[PDB]
Amino acid sequence: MFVDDVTRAFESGDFARPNLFQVEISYLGQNFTFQCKATALPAGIVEKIPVGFMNRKINVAGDRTFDDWTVTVMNDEAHDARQKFVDWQSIAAGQGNEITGGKPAEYKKSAIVRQYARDAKTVTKEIEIKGLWPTNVGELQLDWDSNNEIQTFEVTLALDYWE
Amino acid sequence: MFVDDVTRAFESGDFARPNLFQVEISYLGQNFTFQCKATALPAGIVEKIPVGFMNRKINVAGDRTFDDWTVTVMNDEAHDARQKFVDWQSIAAGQGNEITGGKPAEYKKSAIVRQYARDAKTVTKEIEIKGLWPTNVGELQLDWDSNNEIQTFEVTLALDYWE
Amino acid sequence: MFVDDVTRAFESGDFARPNLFQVEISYLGQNFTFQCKATALPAGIVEKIPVGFMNRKINVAGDRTFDDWTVTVMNDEAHDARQKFVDWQSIAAGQGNEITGGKPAEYKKSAIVRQYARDAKTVTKEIEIKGLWPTNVGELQLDWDSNNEIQTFEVTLALDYWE
Amino acid sequence: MFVDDVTRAFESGDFARPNLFQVEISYLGQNFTFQCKATALPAGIVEKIPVGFMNRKINVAGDRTFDDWTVTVMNDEAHDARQKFVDWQSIAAGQGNEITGGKPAEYKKSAIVRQYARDAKTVTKEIEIKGLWPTNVGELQLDWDSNNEIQTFEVTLALDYWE
Amino acid sequence: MFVDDVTRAFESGDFARPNLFQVEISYLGQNFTFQCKATALPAGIVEKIPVGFMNRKINVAGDRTFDDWTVTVMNDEAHDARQKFVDWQSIAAGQGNEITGGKPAEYKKSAIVRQYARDAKTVTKEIEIKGLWPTNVGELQLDWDSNNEIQTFEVTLALDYWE
Amino acid sequence: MFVDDVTRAFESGDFARPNLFQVEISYLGQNFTFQCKATALPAGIVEKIPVGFMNRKINVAGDRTFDDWTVTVMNDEAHDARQKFVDWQSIAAGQGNEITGGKPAEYKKSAIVRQYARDAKTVTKEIEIKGLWPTNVGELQLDWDSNNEIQTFEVTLALDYWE
Amino acid sequence: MFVDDVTRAFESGDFARPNLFQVEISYLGQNFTFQCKATALPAGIVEKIPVGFMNRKINVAGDRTFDDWTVTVMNDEAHDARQKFVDWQSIAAGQGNEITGGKPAEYKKSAIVRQYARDAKTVTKEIEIKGLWPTNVGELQLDWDSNNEIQTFEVTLALDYWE
Amino acid sequence: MFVDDVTRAFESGDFARPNLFQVEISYLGQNFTFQCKATALPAGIVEKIPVGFMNRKINVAGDRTFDDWTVTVMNDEAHDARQKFVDWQSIAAGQGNEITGGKPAEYKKSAIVRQYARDAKTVTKEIEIKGLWPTNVGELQLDWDSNNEIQTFEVTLALDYWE
Amino acid sequence: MFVDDVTRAFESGDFARPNLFQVEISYLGQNFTFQCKATALPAGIVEKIPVGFMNRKINVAGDRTFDDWTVTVMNDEAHDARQKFVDWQSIAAGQGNEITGGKPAEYKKSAIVRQYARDAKTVTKEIEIKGLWPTNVGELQLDWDSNNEIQTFEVTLALDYWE
Amino acid sequence: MFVDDVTRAFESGDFARPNLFQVEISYLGQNFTFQCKATALPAGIVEKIPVGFMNRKINVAGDRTFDDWTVTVMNDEAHDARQKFVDWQSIAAGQGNEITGGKPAEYKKSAIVRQYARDAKTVTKEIEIKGLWPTNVGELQLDWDSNNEIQTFEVTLALDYWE
Amino acid sequence: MFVDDVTRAFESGDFARPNLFQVEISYLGQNFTFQCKATALPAGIVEKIPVGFMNRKINVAGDRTFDDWTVTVMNDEAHDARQKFVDWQSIAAGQGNEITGGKPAEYKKSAIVRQYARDAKTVTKEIEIKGLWPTNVGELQLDWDSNNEIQTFEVTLALDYWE
Amino acid sequence: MFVDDVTRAFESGDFARPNLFQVEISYLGQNFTFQCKATALPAGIVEKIPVGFMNRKINVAGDRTFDDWTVTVMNDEAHDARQKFVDWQSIAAGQGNEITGGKPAEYKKSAIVRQYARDAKTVTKEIEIKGLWPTNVGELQLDWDSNNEIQTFEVTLALDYWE
């Protein structure tokens, strides 16, 4: 029972940090993977079935659902970082006076998020998400009053499953 | 892997700011485009259809809806900046003891919001919204107790689509 | 594109302030118009009708409703500033062991709120509200613990229309 | 238009304060009127009837309801200040293993709240409430952790009408 | 009208404090009465019956309900202060793989809470609660991050009546 | 009546602390028991049955339910501390393009949480929970903006009963 | 460009001194105007409103506030120089076991401070302050250790405006 | 306008000194009044209420508070000059392993401070303070390094009012 | 590498001095420019935007703000050097029982500060400040105790920009 | 009224000195009582409860707290004077890679501080402090630059009560 | 162990001095490097992450931040030493009535500070700072009262990293 | 009771001095131990837990924290005494355009500080600190104005524990 015992519990004696990750989408491109500021890893949500047997409840495993994947990115001046979400979302549902759609093999894409170790060139864990299309894109905040902030916005991306 | 690598990801090595925009409405006039203090860009909202196949859910693209467009502007002494919203909204629904209406080609207008680059004379991105009429106008706050504030108010403007 | 350009956008180069207004009611009297500390201007509320045509929604103007008008005033020692709301509200609904009412031409009155310019003797804008009767009067807060505050209370006044 | 003009609007040139009141109940006794720390004056609540005539709404006076009267008092060591609420409330509904009731002429009492002027010996306004019985009594907070506080509790008293 | 007049209103010229109480339960034992840190006295809750007679409402006394009794206690190392709640609650409902119950004369107990005067050896008021069994026990919070806190937890105890 | 009397009430004259615990799961392994930062002990939740007899309510013991067990742990670089929750949860419900399940004897496990005394090598109380499977795993927060924080996440674990 | 040029800039070729003033209050009397040792002239405090227009700030005039007026006077043996502040302040708020107040026309007085020229009999500038009542009076310092000092004290006097 | 004119302004042509006072407490005794080295006279503190009327503020008298009374005394060898503060303060709050209190008529005492004229046998002004009990007693400084100093300490005494 | 090398670095081999300046305001007049004793040149304040990219921060230029301009001047006997600040500030906000204001083109003025070379008749650098109005004027210190000092005071002047 | 009258007020005609004390701790030993250079006597801190009754405040005695006890001692070469604080503090909290604790009867000790009369062999006053354990030990200052100083350090010792 | 042993510890037997440095910026020019009087070397700031494991804290390395770089320089008569900071800062943010900006490759420059040995022609250490732009420039102090001083001012320069 | 009695209290009759120490770090080297001018010994910081039992507080030992270790050293011409801190700190966090890290077994080192007796060759006490890495390094002060000073700087070093 020692205070150095927790470093023995982990490999390399180190802690993972909430920064030192990098997420890339092959549909967006190699420049987008520097643009994504913050996100969350998708949870594994399983509902519970309580079943009554004689005044008491035992619990059995229900059915799996998937929580939505929230990603907030930065924005440059030419707005291509936001337009390439809107163009990718307009394949699904379509926008404008004209109406169009897309087949699910056409707009649903995949993404790879990976966390780095303390050595920044090391890739210690890769997490893959499959079947992605953005649920909502935008709510961009712009004002004359906020002065020193950066222009950013959050998008949510529906997913079928993540390995 | 460098800290200067994020400047390579953006054009011109610079970040877009939440200020340095300017929004004009051709119905209001050239003086209104100096009056609008703060707003938001409209999001692209697409609902999700979860569909059950054998204990699991795959997701397909639903239908597009449009979020409301919230704009808050300043106010001068003569209140023409607010009256020209009320006159534009009275074409739609009408106000007073007399009752009147308007055809949708008569009150629904268009607007252009554009963001500037760090050079203020450069127009780097223009975003057009079509089919606009103000949903609600007002809730103006005025009191003897607030001393150093400016007199401002927020309006919301319904829209059909934005390119 | 200059920082002095916003002063060109307004008449007289000045901003309207949230103070420097004065609201009078002809039913209450000339002494009440010094008593009203804070209020709000009534908004123009128009509901929206989304209508489905082929997977999409266009929006048409709905019907006008009127938001309630909230006024909070000060109070002197003799409580006539509050009693004259209660007497004006007892014409409508009546209070006490006896029961009485009033015809709508008898209790519904009018009011004029006006904002001043930076020169305090100038009346730059007059806003008229028609058909007023107080919805609720009171919720007065009085305690031995609040020491340096002033005794005030808020009333809400139903309205038919405001020009 | 002067800053001394607001003192002309009030009698005696003075403001009413949120303290400098004193509330007595003839059922409780002359010692209770020093015990009541804080309360509120009851509001005059009148609901609104919006009625549709041809796309618009005019408003007519609805029906009067009465808001509940909230009083919070101090407490001495012998708890008679709280017991005399419980005894007065046990006439109405009854408490304990035995069950009892009371006729409404027996437990419903009256109360007089009065506000003083800046001269403390002057009674400038008397407000009478009729038909009082306490709705709930208690929720007393007592703990070893709160150190410098006083022991107090809040009661609410149902009322038929207040003049 | 004096500032020393409030000391005349109370017996012994003193105020009751939110500390300086002590609550004992004969089922728990003489050591538990040092363990209870904080609680509340149970309120006397009586619902109101508004009854319509000709556009107005008079109020008559409804029916008595009893609010739940919330007690939060400290915890020693051996957890007997918490186990003796769980054992007392397992008489009522039972816990574990086996299922059991208890008759209401077996698990429902009584409790005496008493407040002391400023002289700590004086018992100025005793309040008795009858028919007690704990509704929920636990939600204990324990973490490596909270450092200087004490380990405590809150229980709620259902009651039939309190004198 | 003394201030040292509370030390007499407890064994060893000491207080239990919210830290100085350690929770192990035999399914996870001996290295996981250093990883769990914070949790809560599960409560004993028993619903109440109010029953009406002649204007009053007596209360009888209802039925036992079990609150969910919330555990938040740390995370190392290789993410095995999180993967071993996902692998343990994929036995129950299954994840990926393929669909699978598990029998309740296969994924439901047990856990032992124990609190230490002030001497850290002493085990003063062991609490056992039976029938555990994680309800949801994840919602991991990772961002470039949070700098000095540690990477952690919270899981909830359904349980049948705890002794 | 000469060193005698600064004497040309002033009238009479002389400088005003920080002594050679004399302040009188008509409420206090003709003997008080020899008693006031030191004070300050009240400043003209105007807050600033910075307003954002397109990455920059222009400034407009805010609202006037008045700084408090600090006066420190000497003291004679009979303490009438201090008692006549306390009597003048007891008209406003009242002191002692009995409680009293005063109307604002009764305790708010005026004062004239005037600076003399180098000829002491000349009155070169008179400054009037209106609406005065002392905010705090006292903090008198008296000790056996301070030997050669004079007994003095500082008072602060609230003001509405000074011409 | 003369330099001898200031002696005409005062009675007896003399100045009051910061020494030449003597303060006695009837509870402490006739020997304590030689022991008190230094103190301050209590101020008359009245808070200000700024009230907004149309861009400006007029000020009305707020509520009286009382500043604490700071007294520093000498100390003899037997420490009775300090013990008689601690015994007088232990009546209020109590000290030691046993816990006790006191009623406010028992520990709150009165004091008379009086200033002498230049003739030391003359009593020119008596100031009475009522309702005194020491807030804190002690912080005594004792060290081997301070050599020629006297042993002294400062106490603060809460007060209700001073005439 | 020589000690005479620093004289080669500057033009004319000389150093600028903190005296040998002269500041004039065209609104005040030609006599005011001899009156200003001391001031400071306004700084160029630009806030910094730290932006997080992968455990590190790069910095980009924020937004310009302007520090306030502090000027302290002398005072003659007739106080016109101070009155002409108060009259210039009363155009902006107004002072007295009457209330008035001013348009920003009416009270905002300009100023030229210039530093001289060692030859006093040479003007080596002119610095212009635009859009000036005094934020606060006064806090004048005058006392019988300060003997050999000169009567002076400090004013602060808000500015839009300085070239 | 004489200057020899102050010697009559004290016993033995003498003053207590800030030196001529000696403090011993039975846990430390008989050699430590020569080591303690400087300290302070613990104060008696009682918080005040201001309570509002009708625009005024009366004060009642709050609750006793204890200020921390600050002791600074000398240091010899072998550092046992500091190590015996660290060993006494390591019983409470423990230090090093291993983690340990102590029961409060094991590390909390007592101390006796006593002041001497001018005759150094006389013990005129003994003050006892109970329940002591050092809060912090150290911050030792050592440098090559301080030459003629002695090596000393200050410790603070938490206490339950002092007689 | 000798007093000459410290000269053996250093190369060349000598000490580095706080003078005998020289800092040049290639953007400013070869004449600026004689102008810089005083500065500081930038620190290496790394925040600490304390992490709780079982009543104790181990520390791991946090994230690097960079402190601002403060440089104070002299000033000649023509003010080009200050203007060339303002021109370099106006590339970043822009100043005046017109508004402009700059790309970060345009205004961010580099600097080399180097310290000399006791032989002044020897360059013993070169320290490079990258990515520099001045945060604030100015606060220049100039007055008629300071006589023998030199005219100087301090600027702060934001930096990305220093080798 | 003698003045030679204090020499009996210490071993060898002598006092420890604030100089006559020497601190070495095995990571830095044998030449660094002559370079360290001044430092402090780390304190033993233990927070206090006040716990409320019946109007009073007893204190129990909280949790140990460690204060930061501040060391200021000299500097030679070649700056290796400072570079070897920066290189040791760049193992932890990394500096420059490239980003790197280090495992906690790689950068955390140990140090031995020891104090000498009056005989300089005697080592009377050795104090070991474990787990060291510098928190911040630098803030070096260098100027042309400081003439006779030596070039020095202070670093702070985070620590896990010291024996």
PDB file of N, CA, C and O in Angstrom, chain K residues 70-95:
ATOM      1  N   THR K  70       8.738  41.035 -21.324  1.00  0.00           N
ATOM      2  CA  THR K  70       8.674  42.449 -20.988  1.00  0.00           C
ATOM      3  C   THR K  70      10.002  43.114 -21.305  1.00  0.00           C
ATOM      4  O   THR K  70      11.049  42.693 -20.804  1.00  0.00           O
ATOM      5  N   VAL K  71       9.953  44.150 -22.134  1.00  0.00           N
ATOM      6  CA  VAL K  71      11.123  44.880 -22.602  1.00  0.00           C
ATOM      7  C   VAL K  71      10.871  46.363 -22.393  1.00  0.00           C
ATOM      8  O   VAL K  71       9.830  46.878 -22.808  1.00  0.00           O
ATOM      9  N   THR K  72      11.801  47.046 -21.738  1.00  0.00           N
ATOM     10  CA  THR K  72      11.730  48.493 -21.625  1.00  0.00           C
ATOM     11  C   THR K  72      12.950  49.132 -22.272  1.00  0.00           C
ATOM     12  O   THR K  72      14.087  48.721 -22.032  1.00  0.00           O
ATOM     13  N   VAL K  73      12.693  50.117 -23.133  1.00  0.00           N
ATOM     14  CA  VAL K  73      13.710  50.717 -23.982  1.00  0.00           C
ATOM     15  C   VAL K  73      13.778  52.207 -23.689  1.00  0.00           C
ATOM     16  O   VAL K  73      12.908  52.776 -23.028  1.00  0.00           O
ATOM     17  N   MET K  74      14.830  52.838 -24.198  1.00  0.00           N
ATOM     18  CA  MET K  74      14.955  54.283 -24.126  1.00  0.00           C
ATOM     19  C   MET K  74      14.216  54.926 -25.293  1.00  0.00           C
ATOM     20  O   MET K  74      13.595  54.251 -26.115  1.00  0.00           O
ATOM     21  N   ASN K  75      14.290  56.250 -25.365  1.00  0.00           N
ATOM     22  CA  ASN K  75      13.564  57.000 -26.378  1.00  0.00           C
ATOM     23  C   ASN K  75      14.384  58.209 -26.787  1.00  0.00           C
ATOM     24  O   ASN K  75      14.885  58.942 -25.930  1.00  0.00           O
ATOM     25  N   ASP K  76      14.515  58.421 -28.090  1.00  0.00           N
ATOM     26  CA  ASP K  76      15.128  59.645 -28.567  1.00  0.00           C
ATOM     27  C   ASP K  76      14.068  60.697 -28.858  1.00  0.00           C
ATOM     28  O   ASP K  76      12.874  60.496 -28.628  1.00  0.00           O
ATOM     29  N   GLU K  77      14.534  61.830 -29.383  1.00  0.00           N
ATOM     30  CA  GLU K  77      13.679  63.001 -29.545  1.00  0.00           C
ATOM     31  C   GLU K  77      12.637  62.790 -30.632  1.00  0.00           C
ATOM     32  O   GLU K  77      11.480  63.193 -30.481  1.00  0.00           O
ATOM     33  N   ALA K  78      13.021  62.125 -31.722  1.00  0.00           N
ATOM     34  CA  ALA K  78      12.136  62.015 -32.877  1.00  0.00           C
ATOM     35  C   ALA K  78      11.082  60.931 -32.701  1.00  0.00           C
ATOM     36  O   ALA K  78      10.245  60.746 -33.592  1.00  0.00           O
ATOM     37  N   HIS K  79      11.131  60.188 -31.588  1.00  0.00           N
ATOM     38  CA  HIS K  79      10.189  59.127 -31.227  1.00  0.00           C
ATOM     39  C   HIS K  79      10.112  57.992 -32.233  1.00  0.00           C
ATOM     40  O   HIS K  79       9.092  57.302 -32.290  1.00  0.00           O
ATOM     41  N   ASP K  80      11.153  57.759 -33.033  1.00  0.00           N
ATOM     42  CA  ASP K  80      11.096  56.633 -33.958  1.00  0.00           C
ATOM     43  C   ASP K  80      11.271  55.314 -33.221  1.00  0.00           C
ATOM     44  O   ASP K  80      10.819  54.267 -33.695  1.00  0.00           O
ATOM     45  N   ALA K  81      11.909  55.348 -32.050  1.00  0.00           N
ATOM     46  CA  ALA K  81      12.067  54.136 -31.258  1.00  0.00           C
ATOM     47  C   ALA K  81      10.729  53.652 -30.717  1.00  0.00           C
ATOM     48  O   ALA K  81      10.551  52.459 -30.461  1.00  0.00           O
ATOM     49  N   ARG K  82       9.772  54.563 -30.545  1.00  0.00           N
ATOM     50  CA  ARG K  82       8.442  54.162 -30.112  1.00  0.00           C
ATOM     51  C   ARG K  82       7.500  53.974 -31.292  1.00  0.00           C
ATOM     52  O   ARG K  82       6.639  53.089 -31.262  1.00  0.00           O
ATOM     53  N   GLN K  83       7.651  54.796 -32.334  1.00  0.00           N
ATOM     54  CA  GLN K  83       6.796  54.697 -33.514  1.00  0.00           C
ATOM     55  C   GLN K  83       6.993  53.370 -34.233  1.00  0.00           C
ATOM     56  O   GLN K  83       6.046  52.803 -34.791  1.00  0.00           O
ATOM     57  N   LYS K  84       8.210  52.833 -34.189  1.00  0.00           N
ATOM     58  CA  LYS K  84       8.471  51.577 -34.875  1.00  0.00           C
ATOM     59  C   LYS K  84       7.932  50.389 -34.093  1.00  0.00           C
ATOM     60  O   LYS K  84       7.851  49.279 -34.627  1.00  0.00           O
ATOM     61  N   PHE K  85       7.567  50.588 -32.825  1.00  0.00           N
ATOM     62  CA  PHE K  85       6.731  49.593 -32.163  1.00  0.00           C
ATOM     63  C   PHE K  85       5.277  49.748 -32.568  1.00  0.00           C
ATOM     64  O   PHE K  85       4.569  48.753 -32.745  1.00  0.00           O
ATOM     65  N   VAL K  86       4.810  50.988 -32.700  1.00  0.00           N
ATOM     66  CA  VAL K  86       3.404  51.225 -33.003  1.00  0.00           C
ATOM     67  C   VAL K  86       3.093  50.819 -34.436  1.00  0.00           C
ATOM     68  O   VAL K  86       2.038  50.241 -34.716  1.00  0.00           O
ATOM     69  N   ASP K  87       4.020  51.085 -35.357  1.00  0.00           N
ATOM     70  CA  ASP K  87       3.843  50.647 -36.736  1.00  0.00           C
ATOM     71  C   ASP K  87       3.883  49.127 -36.831  1.00  0.00           C
ATOM     72  O   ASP K  87       3.138  48.524 -37.608  1.00  0.00           O
ATOM     73  N   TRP K  88       4.726  48.492 -36.021  1.00  0.00           N
ATOM     74  CA  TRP K  88       4.790  47.036 -36.018  1.00  0.00           C
ATOM     75  C   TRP K  88       3.569  46.433 -35.347  1.00  0.00           C
ATOM     76  O   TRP K  88       3.170  45.307 -35.658  1.00  0.00           O
ATOM     77  N   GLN K  89       2.946  47.178 -34.441  1.00  0.00           N
ATOM     78  CA  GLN K  89       1.748  46.680 -33.781  1.00  0.00           C
ATOM     79  C   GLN K  89       0.502  47.019 -34.590  1.00  0.00           C
ATOM     80  O   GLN K  89      -0.509  46.314 -34.508  1.00  0.00           O
ATOM     81  N   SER K  90       0.577  48.053 -35.429  1.00  0.00           N
ATOM     82  CA  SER K  90      -0.569  48.413 -36.259  1.00  0.00           C
ATOM     83  C   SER K  90      -0.721  47.470 -37.442  1.00  0.00           C
ATOM     84  O   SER K  90      -1.762  47.462 -38.105  1.00  0.00           O
ATOM     85  N   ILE K  91       0.320  46.693 -37.749  1.00  0.00           N
ATOM     86  CA  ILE K  91       0.166  45.641 -38.746  1.00  0.00           C
ATOM     87  C   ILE K  91      -0.749  44.553 -38.210  1.00  0.00           C
ATOM     88  O   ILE K  91      -1.598  44.019 -38.932  1.00  0.00           O
ATOM     89  N   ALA K  92      -0.621  44.245 -36.922  1.00  0.00           N
ATOM     90  CA  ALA K  92      -1.455  43.214 -36.319  1.00  0.00           C
ATOM     91  C   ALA K  92      -2.901  43.671 -36.195  1.00  0.00           C
ATOM     92  O   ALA K  92      -3.799  43.099 -36.820  1.00  0.00           O
ATOM     93  N   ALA K  93      -3.143  44.720 -35.416  1.00  0.00           N
ATOM     94  CA  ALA K  93      -4.498  45.100 -35.059  1.00  0.00           C
ATOM     95  C   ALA K  93      -5.014  46.347 -35.753  1.00  0.00           C
ATOM     96  O   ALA K  93      -6.226  46.448 -35.959  1.00  0.00           O
ATOM     97  N   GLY K  94      -4.159  47.296 -36.101  1.00  0.00           N
ATOM     98  CA  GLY K  94      -4.610  48.487 -36.785  1.00  0.00           C
ATOM     99  C   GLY K  94      -5.131  49.547 -35.832  1.00  0.00           C
ATOM    100  O   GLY K  94      -5.740  49.262 -34.804  1.00  0.00           O
ATOM    101  N   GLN K  95      -4.893  50.800 -36.203  1.00  0.00           N
ATOM    102  CA  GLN K  95      -5.181  51.924 -35.327  1.00  0.00           C
ATOM    103  C   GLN K  95      -5.632  53.097 -36.182  1.00  0.00           C
ATOM    104  O   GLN K  95      -5.140  53.302 -37.292  1.00  0.00           O
TER     105      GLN K  95
END
